[PDB]
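ASSEMBLY PREDICTION REQUEST
Request ID: AP-0331
Submitted by: J.K., bench scientist
Number of chains: four
Total residues: 858
Priority: normal
Notes: Please return the full assembly, not individual chains.
Input sequences:
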Amino acid sequence: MKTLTGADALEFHKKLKERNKALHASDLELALVHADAVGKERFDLEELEKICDTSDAGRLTDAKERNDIYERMYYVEYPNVMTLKEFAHIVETLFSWS
Amino acid sequence: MKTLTGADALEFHKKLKERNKALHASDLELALVHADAVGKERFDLEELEKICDTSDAGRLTDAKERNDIYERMYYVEYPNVMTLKEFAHIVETLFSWS
Amino acid sequence: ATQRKGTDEIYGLGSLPSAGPGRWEYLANPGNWHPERRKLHEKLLDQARSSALTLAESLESDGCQPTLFALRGNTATGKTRIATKKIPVLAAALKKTAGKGCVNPDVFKSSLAKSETGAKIFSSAQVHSESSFLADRFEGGLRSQKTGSGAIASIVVDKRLSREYEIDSYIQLAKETGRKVELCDIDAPLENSLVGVLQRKPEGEDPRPPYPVVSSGFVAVRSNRMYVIDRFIADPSLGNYRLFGTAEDGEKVMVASVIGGEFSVENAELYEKITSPQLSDLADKVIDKELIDRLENNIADPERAAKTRAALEKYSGKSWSAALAAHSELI
Amino acid sequence: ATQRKGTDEIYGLGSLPSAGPGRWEYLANPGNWHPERRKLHEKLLDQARSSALTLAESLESDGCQPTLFALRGNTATGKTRIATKKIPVLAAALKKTAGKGCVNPDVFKSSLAKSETGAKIFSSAQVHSESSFLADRFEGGLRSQKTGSGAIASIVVDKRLSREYEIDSYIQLAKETGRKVELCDIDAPLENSLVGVLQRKPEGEDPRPPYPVVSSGFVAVRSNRMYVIDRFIADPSLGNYRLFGTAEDGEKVMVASVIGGEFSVENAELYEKITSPQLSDLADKVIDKELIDRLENNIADPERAAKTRAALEKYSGKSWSAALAAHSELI
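STATUS: Completed
Returned structure:
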């Protein structure tokens, strides 16, 4: 198809960003409502950190990043996981691979 | 899966509405940028109305509705249609059926 | 006739006014019609009204208060099955009329297309305008129609009902005439509607629209779905709402409902899917062995599986758009 | 060993500290390792550094200024092919090392898993921690590495690079060491990554991760894609960015690029698709004849078609999650 250039490319890029940001926000919002309804355990980084490592061997430092990454993963990607305990198995799996 | 009830159902419903409204808006926004880039003819209801009928034999009256319906259809559903002239064939087709 | 002129040009007297309500009021005037056609119109309204009245009497006798039964959903989504199974009071009434008596702009099409000659001679598109006008007069006569108890008659509207203005108008109709609104909203994926249309045989009476009708119907019914639900969430006394969607194996399941003001989501995942049209292009997709096998892989019922592949095989190598177009032009 | 203990527990001296940078600084200390293992570490860093230096010399001789070549993309998306075809200066250098010399946390895995014994005896997961630590030391020695002209050495990083903090850190590295950033970002649909992983043979050295690794990698690389592009839109002197996506027939096409500050979208439709993870559930989907046929229907290359169905047939009747899990546990 036709390549978008100059101002059109930029504007398509800007509008797509807004679209993906609303989708991003909405995915978590919707997952949280469903998590309350099934009685999924509230996400707690500290408790999770006690049972596995969420620093990437220290590569990941900013705690506002570690929360965002793992809370969102817990609710959005793994909606059938119900406990922080189970989610730890998963996180450990992710850390064992590249 | 588990039925959502009471406040959870309502909240899922509210959050889904926002999601679909951003998607709704974004679909048109993105289609307009792409339409400018390919040089698709600007949507003009009056010109379209001169070549076909956009009232549903008068069932459709509110001109702010007729524009919204057809402009959005023109850009979002039929992005490879480039002329109001071609889009008229389509609208005529839609009006010939239930 | 000479070309695909409409029956309103052919049987209409004099020039055809370009735009309803100028063409509308012209159509609404019997003197504007040939006497044979005007006589045909009267006969079909009498048949239809007799059927509707039968539905209304059955419904009232089964303790149903004045009700507008509305069957919302895109073409060939499986609305008849849902009605038959999920609205048992209506299923009992429809059985006494073999499904006749409903308000539907296509109800008169076969009769008008055969013109009492014994064979279909006009295309659906040729008779559409005429049958739309007859359906509106049919519906008009029903709005303050009474049964033998003096009660307002229950009626059945099975249109796509895809747009807000349509929804608003039927609500207003119900409110003004003291009717409850029983609304079943039925969803299937677009490809199921396309397959559904190709399975419909010309000798059968169910309409065979081309691709843009089915696709645009799908977008609109999905995009306006939650507005419909809001009307019921906002006003519990309007009546009841139920949404049925299609699982992977093709079975209808309830997805959301408002029953007596109670709002629940029986299937959150499907609810998210079937309230948006998911624009991610189907019209150009070619019907090949793989598409056919894929669709068959989620059909376990033998008769349906067979009819489905038989319909698709007839247009193998064609795009959806070309298949529906070809299947649409059949008379 | 006795169970799936890691090689850092096995070859590490004394107790293993629970949390890097406590486990990190413990790993970083050679005295904390058995002398045989420490000797193995030195030998592999020397092999790796010799390869990287070869890449750097080839790149500089071909007139390439100090550059961090970054190959972003989820597992098994087709990054090697893209590099080989779309970065010809790198393709010429990689040919002199048979693809060795790149910074990749998996580069040491096979050597560590065989421990110079002549056969693979540790699982990928057993050696992962150790090889991650070796990769970081490898990369550390490269950051201010020089060629024979005194110029900073070009380097090649082919990690998933899915997260913002990863992206930020490599940009900072490049900025601090005077390197340009040449970034190719390669996307395939998740199912292509899953099929890609099942085609990878245990005797082959390319990693075989289980489902959650591939899926979570996919979500992250897609969700963080536009942030990467912004860095290049915002700072043209950073270097160049190119995004390649996968068409229906499986061919890579360019989707977006920032080349010399110029931003263009070569494929708007794909750009919209491949900047979000489209959560609409794959882990439980069963590999059956239909899935296999469907995937085959869009593969025209015979060798690839064959390898693809051969890999899938081995796990027919299994879910994606179960197939990757089983294929992952192979040594």
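REVIEWER COMMENTS: Chain B has one domain: 1-98.
SIGN-OFF: pending second reviewer
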